[model samples]
Target chain A: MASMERFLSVYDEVQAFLLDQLQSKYEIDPNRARYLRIMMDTTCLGGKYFRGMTVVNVAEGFLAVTQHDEATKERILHDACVGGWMIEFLQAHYLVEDDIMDGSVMRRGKPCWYRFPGVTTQCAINDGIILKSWTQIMAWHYFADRPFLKDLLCLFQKVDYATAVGQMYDVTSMCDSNKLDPEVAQPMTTDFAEFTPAIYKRIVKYKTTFYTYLLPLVMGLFVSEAAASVEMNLVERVAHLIGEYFQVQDDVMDCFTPPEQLGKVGTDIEDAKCSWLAVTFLGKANAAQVAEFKANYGDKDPAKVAVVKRLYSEANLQADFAAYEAEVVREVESLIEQLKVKSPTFAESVAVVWEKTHKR
Target chain B: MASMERFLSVYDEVQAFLLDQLQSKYEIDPNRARYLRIMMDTTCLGGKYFRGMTVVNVAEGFLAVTQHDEATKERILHDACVGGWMIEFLQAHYLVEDDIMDGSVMRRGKPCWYRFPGVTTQCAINDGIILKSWTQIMAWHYFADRPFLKDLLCLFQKVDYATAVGQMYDVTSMCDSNKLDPEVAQPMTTDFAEFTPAIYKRIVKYKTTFYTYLLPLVMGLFVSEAAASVEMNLVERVAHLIGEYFQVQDDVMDCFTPPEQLGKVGTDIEDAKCSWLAVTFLGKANAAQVAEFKANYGDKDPAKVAVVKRLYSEANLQADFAAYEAEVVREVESLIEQLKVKSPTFAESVAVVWEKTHKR
Candidate 1:
């Protein structure tokens, strides 16, 4: 986290450049220009920059091990910046559609992109496609000499397709899974824990982890020859554990984070989001609590939100999430110890992971 | 036109291949699978294979003059098939959205893709993007070796972008403009003569001719040996005229063609589509007729459609359309005659234009 000001300044410069490119080259209409800018702002702002920062941080870490020439360091840093933005762009693509599907009103302290004046809920769908297309065009333009451009592009495409299918499943479950079940009104519980949350976790893994944690670390590792000695599966396991914990923290923060820090209305209750907490808590709730929770949750009334919150509290949702979070952290710590014995460069990634998980 | 069976066989084979691709690759769930099949049927079926056939017809015309080998002629024919499919894909993209925007229930003897069970209105919007992406991907894969791949890709990209923007305008105008002038509730009577039909023409140009008539002819010309001799500007002008006439014919047919032949319940009246006939009729309608038409037109009642038909008949709408269509044909013929002095290959496109405009 040192040199945070320097990273922030660089991030600002990248945003300015992106905004200018979109406005000047693509802004053929007033409405389109405004929509694109607003969508970009809502998607790009409010993140802790952990993913993007890792890109830059990993590059610097690589330079430390290599004692390489200045040009090599600069090249790695440039690639890192591009990689970071590509991840953010993908997040923006999915979040815009997710907001519409969930009927979310605000994001990152502002109105959801689809709710802006003159924007139909339909336009948000188009905006998501544009967001994805921009990533393709930008990656091709920026990573001219990157080792795995095709592999990377295909990975991004697969992630997008998988995430969309997951969203479709999530929406179908809420809107029309009744046809598959005779007891449709039985509080909609499931025996398989992995079926629902695993979908979301797969989304989080591709949508968050590699870009935020593993890719950046690996990119730097490659630059310093540390990639040669490191066990790739071990690296991914540690990264995946961290990513899971990060998302569980996000679910907890969505409900309980102080209003100022959260910076937006919490709609997990209203939106019927299939967060880890909700799925896990439902598994533990009694039949009466389950029925009561399902009836009152996602209702627009404040009283209904209060009722769901009370039921959720009685189910010890927060405590369950906390325990799961600690479990993931401990698993990651164990992997970090294994890595430290094998590769010091990976040990550096552990340090970064520690700072991210513990700093707040 | 003489070898119609040849083109029909190509159409049938292409349709089968496209359907298989969807079934194997795109069919994820029952709902999505159904919509995908519906969209594919509506978009891929129907249509006279006019554009695709032109690739063959025009390439034959080119072969007649150039005496090209069978291999070359076959290559040009293959290019024509893909080029024509691109145009069909582009039109389907826009038409799907138009169906949702205008709330039309049926197209090509079946329910609109947006109205199909398990498909939301939002997928209709994404259908257009899917079409564009599919066309681009096809171009990259099939025409990668063709000299004109770059131009072909750029042409489709420009066409897609323009049509998308036009849809944005069309949707915004219908939703926003009507709010400004509540008195102009009947758009056909009041706003039909001004910017409305002009915008429609632009949309058709972007949506239709740019990819359909021009793309096939130019792609054939570029992939052929006489590419250097083919004057692109003249081809564009002629293509524009033919395309306008072609769409105007469709507008005329929407009113006059048998339901069996057209294969759908035409709702141009209820939708108040800015057809060339309507624009021309507005210029020719008497003041009383204009007032009565404004009050009574756009009603979906059988009597209302009949009454509007009577008004159009009284105004000699069909005669005016025929005359306008003939004038455009003459203009293209004269241009072709003038160009034939320099290059017979260039003049061959004139036949392609005539076949498209005067399709029986």
Candidate 2:
């Protein structure tokens, strides 16, 4: 965390550049300009900086960013930071809309941007677009001269496509999130049939895996011009396994941890999410337990939630998750171990990413 | 309009390519893929095809897309079609979001996507992002090998930024749409100060001109490899002037035309929009008339709207608009005359775009 300041510094730098670029290049209304400037801070400043840090750290890992060639170092570092923020910028776009989609009322422990008095669903939605647009705008402006600029831009966009698809899968899996057809709603136990281990893997791989895991690592290598060193398939496999593990842990934490302990309220139960725990319970629970889970899973009633929690405990879902998490580590490590050829540093850099995957 | 079939053909062609790309390259959930495939048709098929046609028409004007060189012609025609649909695709993206932001009840004589029984606000929001994402996704997929691909993609992103900014301006200029702060909403007549002629032009230029006029035209030039042949500044200037006229006519039509004629309800008076007609009236009204205008404007009551409409007539905004439209034609001709150096066809191609600007 102490070493995070360098990557985090990119927020202010890039945001300042963003505002200045808009102000100078466009006929910016003074108040609208100020409004956007405030929006940048509110939305982007609160993140954990893990994605941004991954971009910089992986870029530095592959190619030295040092004073031996000051200009080169400065250029690499600045571009790396820009690449990093692009992912963070994209994450903001998703969060703004995701909150609206989920009907969630909080983001990073603050009032969801949509719930703020001044920013209703409409303004929040527009802001989400502005952030999405800024990602490419900044990339196009700053990386205009890079030889592999198209690849970087395409990488950002292709990942954007994947994430949207993942969101579609994720949304449609839960009866609570399924807005396309009211008739599609089913009991929570039946919903678990939809979020089977296969479907869960596809959703996480597409939704969380591409952007969260693959993008930073691949983007870092892309920007540093070290793209050819690693095997593309191996990198993707490692990324998917890691991304799958991360979401499973997130699903686990949401159910077991208190809001104060987790820094946000958990609603995967009442929301009828396809969390790993729910899927696991559906697989192992006896016939009697299945009936209780079916009744309580998607209900917002506190007593219903309590019943669901007790059933999960009776089923020892946490133990299942721990075991699942361990197996994921074994698979991820095994995959990355096959990815051992790229100067050993490539595999090591991925190891660094994995260490942060399973948070308590 | 008869020849417009070629450009419009790109919609089905590219949407097929898009879904194919997603399905083959990614682990697309069958239902999510089907949902998006339906989204493509529902959102995109309703457009007027003017933007897409302009891209092809302008491109064909610059380069002879004829039968003599069949491969060359196919290349130009196909890329031109792809270029055209990219604009229409972006248009779809904006419309979906705009309907949400404006709370538009109907689009193209049907219920707004957000208003549909199953696709609520959240599903509609994601659909907007998906459309926005697909524009680039399609462009990147189709034009990956073109030397000018970067310019084409950047054009799409920069214009996305402009359209979003335009929406922000269009939204915040009204007491009705202002979601940022409560204290900012003032009387409609007083609100005109923030949306003077200068502000109106900026909003329209960025919002409509860039995407509607400039994008299709410039993209035509870029894709046909004729970008170096035209004066960039002249195209932008012509685009801005025509876009201003287009929006002014739209504003005038919204006020004067019946819902049957306009195809939708007129809400500018109640919405406190910074329409050109309003801007013109703000300049002409006497204090007594202005007082009435202030009282009536931005009110939801039909009687209030009647008073505002009466004031606009007393000031003869229709006459003012007629004079302005004539002047706009004179100025556009003068500018395009200077732009006649790159083949008389260059300027004439723009004339085709201008003819559609002030639709009856």
Candidate 3:
């Protein structure tokens, strides 16, 4: 029942703290200096504060453990803010490097850091390292002698390692030479036609689920010393299901939503991103439809884009996606009910997720 | 005393274990497959095994308190080799990324990893991350449950961080910028020229001292439970001095060593590496000489290469480097003598250093 303004105020204050840290720590060359400024600006601009605020909101819920004392609330907020900062930090670490890896031109409506003026391709990799290191340093500085220092450190390390592995798997899925195992330099026709929606969903679940939702909540739980409770495991199960559906929803929205709603140009097709829609569309297509998709999909031409859209409609994959979204929402609602009736903290956390799921 | 063959046998075994770990645990794809192969090959190539052998040698010296039986030697060697592998990991980490960053075509008399066929620039950056992550994973796998695990992990982290900061300083020094505060980026010519030697020593010490020499020995001390003794501190002090001079000798030999003896091409001039000689040459050069040096140094033109060498000789910086090398060696010898009479471990370690120092 806390006002959204209260959470928004904490987020803004923490964002400013992160910018201040970057400026004070690495006041190096003009190019490196300017690069940090641009990165800070871009990362803070868009995206709902759901992941970050979850860390704070979850920690705030733990304030009951201290009988709602002012000191305990302040401590939880500090850790919560740091946890939120870490979510964004994790995003920056992946996004900056991913930009270079994917040869992306724009991110968050601005030039990619590597593509910016005076930034070298090599420095972008180092910039990613610096950002990751800063998060670790900040955590160390904040939790140096605290009782949960080791646990918090280990949690971040595990999360970072898992996230890096997830990204590696993602890049591997797209670029693996042995995807076909026996095929060689083969054209994309019959061999590429066998991908299932289930396989794609698993990929999205592994890569996007943990970092986007699980890590933020888990981080806050560790800070609040509630990680061992049975309720924590239940929350993880619910979060992963919701997160997977959330990612699937995002994939659909990327193609169908208007620019103002999605906040970016639609290039999911041209970029050949492995999304839920792409997988389902491929799965449902017949031989002729598959041929049409191969010819029209992954091409930047407007005519091709139109053809692919028509083929997707013909295949009725959009309708399938709509049905899947509804089913997922029902499943989430059921789980929320179970938690609400069973655990109070679970009820509080579910409300936040409910708000996120219902939005957009 | 352990013969060279004994040390070599242990080193070879350690290398085999390291290769297995990388292949079994860290292998990602064909690109990484090729990269790990290259790293293993390069790491196993020519280098004195003094640093790598310290763990076994020092642990044996501390066996009285450690009560290490027959298996103790193997355990110490395994632990030491992991520490030794850390240095190789760091060196390869730098060389692989530096090659990509600098766009150099060759390294250690072979085509750099980035220059390999079908290897994109993006994969090269990922390869560096893979290299970094392997170090941590190796540390965890090898020493996670050991009593000194935290100490060893923290040591490597600090060493890596310090070395990286030095690298950033070195790179920024080369490309002077307006945004960099003058107070922070001391002028090469006049401001803080005297302090440059002190900073250079610190940079070299951070770059080489602990990782190359002190790390294995200190780690050996920890595993043997001799970490608290004054004798171990003496070992660190002696090893540190030896490491400092050893690096200075490496720098001196980079310029004056015959091509047949040097592993790398004898052209620091063409590499644009800001070395001790380059820094000293810049500090002493008259305005005319400074301009001429810049124009000729790092130029591929053979005529300009000769001119830059002639300018350094005219400035007598080569003699200064030689004089500085002699002073460093003398100071290291004095420290070695102070320790050699007390601990047999110290004498054995100093002898290993001297053997490398006197290498043709």
Candidate 4:
């Protein structure tokens, strides 16, 4: 309960910091301020904030284990929350552009900011830039005196660049999904034969894992001043492993869950996304099943969606998912155990991510 | 002739630096690298490079007066080129999005990057981000060890934020050109009555002066390590005065110059741009002329364009522009004479900008 309360408090702190920076610290013109304010309110707020929570939790956990004094701990935690907000701000920036690129209408149960009144697609592009700029600006404000400031700025830039490349791959894949010429078209495809598990993993690793899983914890470690002591390679490896599992689960849930449960309708199938379930089902299907899957995989028609759903059910993907979940849990648990011996706080951070993502 | 050769050499150096950073420095996927390379080649190259040249020239000029050693001067000039390249990169980034937002078809006599094969408006958004990210990355690589690194980063961020707000204001004004209410609509408009000289000057300061004129000179000053001696406010004020004049000339030229000479069709009148000519003409027109200007302004038809042009001629705008130009030149020359006492190189830099921009 205390941990949860602390997480909420950090979240609130991060939110307040961003609002203050935008409202008071920056000398924004009144006319532009209205649009910027709307963009901040609509895009940055209302996230589940799991990524942010990890930063706060890990920083707190590290300080607790190190037995730091209350004043030191409090200041570090506050800076950690700034890192947390940076991650959230980066996420919001990506989502704003991603939604525009994906042609997504609704996000977090509301109209996408691009679709808001008086906000055109062009303004959304600038708004995304503003969000990204604010992330750095806020970091400069809070962590300019810190030793790890340069590291934090570089990490954010690297992750953002990587995620952008990943998005390009994802977009290219969809655009080339129907093409047959291997020399011209990208390998990303709806055809089960053309798609591979390796490709899916690469996309997930770059697009989701780096930012969603590894970034927050890395930031937390940096904030706690424990970055040099911890083995980042092992940490990143374990995070990626868990991230792959989490994305796969998300893909499955998108296909299996109702619209209300998912908050937005699953457009992966319609969007020709190289989903894990589609790849897995293809891996195990016979020739006729493969043909059927290919025909309906990326079709947006309700009947085609039904046919795909039936194929997943008949193939016992739910059972397969359960088994896969169990295996991932075992592997994550074993990794966490090893991590625990070296850095219990780091291990706890990884475990917290696991608990939040793995919840059914 | 030697100075021009040196300037071109720095230009080539900056271009090579940008290409190398894109091609090798970042660990981009091969698939995504293709698009990024094309974007760099298409957007960053082929400009007048006046902004970049100012950085190199000013830095050299500053060092000349300061009497730095040859080797030190050479190295600093190279670094100043990086700052030169940074400004060019930023300009390209803005133009990419601006061209898209303005529905401009051609830039530098070729299709805009967004209009290129296999590129969408969505990818352009990411491309813009990539350009922005690379600007920082290049700065980090070149200037990280410098005493003024933090100042450079903050300056870049501040300028970018200001430019974005300026763009927002520019965009909002265009959209709200015909609207009646101020509470809901943006204040940007094509109506001459709706725009004031104060608003026009504000836009020029934020959008053109800071990045285009002031930034390169400021960057040059910083690179020369002479930032402490010079007053930036005086520098900015002088740059803005020149920039405002430059933009006014551009507005006049858009209507006066033939399409072949300008290398593209002028659409400011049709685009409902808050142009200096429109504002000035409106300031002097009678009631019926105002009515005619209102009806014909922002219309796409060539006849409507002609009507507006005829109004400008009838209002003796060319004579007013000539007088305005003379007055501005006098003011700028006086400012440069004052600047020369403190920083001759800085004064020379302003003179060079004037030479390039005052060709007409």
lDDT of residue A288 for candidate 4: 94
Per-residue C-alpha lDDT of model 1 across residues A17-123, encoded as one tens digit per residue: 65566456433344445545656666666777676666667666656666667887666666667666676776777677667656677777767777765465545
Residue A259 displacement (Å), model 4:
2.1
Superposed model 4: Cα runs more than 4 Å off: A1-31, A66-71, A175-194, B1-31, B65-71, B175-193
| Position A330, candidate 3: lDDT | 85
The CA lDDT at B133 in model 1 is: 49
Clashes in predicted model 2:
1
Q: Judged by lDDT relative to the true structure, which candidate is superior, 2 or 3?
A: 2
lDDT, candidate 2, B165-269, per-residue tens = 888877777643233452232333454466578877877887788898888889888877878888889998998888888888788878988887576787888
User: What's the lDDT for residue B235 in model 1?
Assistant: 81
Write down the worst ten-residue block by lDDT for model 1 chain B.
B180-189
Residue A82 error, candidate 4, Å? 2.2
Compute the DockQ of candidate 2.
0.48
DockQ of each: 0.12, 0.48, 0.20, 0.32
Estimate how well candidate 1 is docked, as a DockQ score. 0.12
- Writing each residue's lDDT as its tens digit, candidate 2 over A242-262 gives 888888878877888778767
Which portions of model 3 show Cα errors greater than 4 Å?
A1-49, A65-69, A175-190, A231-236, A253-267, A299-306, A313-316, A334-342, B1-61, B64-66, B70-74, B180-218, B230-272, B298-303, B313-317, B337-360
| Clash list (residue pairs), candidate 4 | B173-B188, B173-B189
Highest DockQ scorer:
2
Note the residue pairs that clash in candidate 3.
none
Ranking by TM-score: 2, 4, 3, 1
- Per-candidate Cα lDDT values, in order, are 0.62, 0.79, 0.64, 0.77
Candidate that scores best on TM-score: 2
Q: Put down candidate 4 lDDT per residue, B1-360, tens digits, no spaces.
A: 564567567656655665565457444445455556667768888877788888888876777667667898887878877888888889988998788777788877787777765676767767877787778778877787988787788788778877876776666655543442223424344445547777777777777777888788888878888887776767977888988888898888888888777766889888777888887887788999989988898889999999999998899998878888899889989988888778776787788889888886
